[PDB]
Write a protein that binds this DNA or RNA. Structure first.
Length: 67
RNA sequence: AUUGAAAGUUGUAGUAUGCGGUCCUUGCGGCUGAGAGCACUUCAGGAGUUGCCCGCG
């Protein structure tokens, strides 16, 4: 509902949320925007579900537990 | 931020459809609350009494 809802993963719209893995290192937003996963700052800036529920990036670590 | 971190044991599904507690059946026939019976027997409205008293068509 909020206008800031663009910053969400495509998985979230489908009620997914496995949140990537070894074979995945690029995040696709709702509009299909490429997001890199080197650092947690950009991950939580460009994605909202990963900010609050955490995520997992085994290639580069950056583990974030859910709040 | 604990060998923990990400995670629906998930989504769709009628015990459902038709099936008479049914058809016949007298609470039926006979039956005296009847026969006997004095509101009878005794009885005065009774005993006293001046329409009373005066009189010129």
């Amino acid at each position: 509902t909020t206008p800031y809802g663009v910053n969400l993963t495509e998985r979230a719209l489908r009620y997914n949320g496995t949140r990537f893995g070894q074979g995945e290192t690029t995040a696709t937003k709702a509009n299909g925007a490429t997001v890199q996963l080197n650092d947690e700052a950009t991950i939580i800036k460009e994605l909202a579900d990963a900010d609050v529920h955490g995520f997992l990036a085994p290639k580069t670590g950056r583990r974030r537990v859910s709040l």
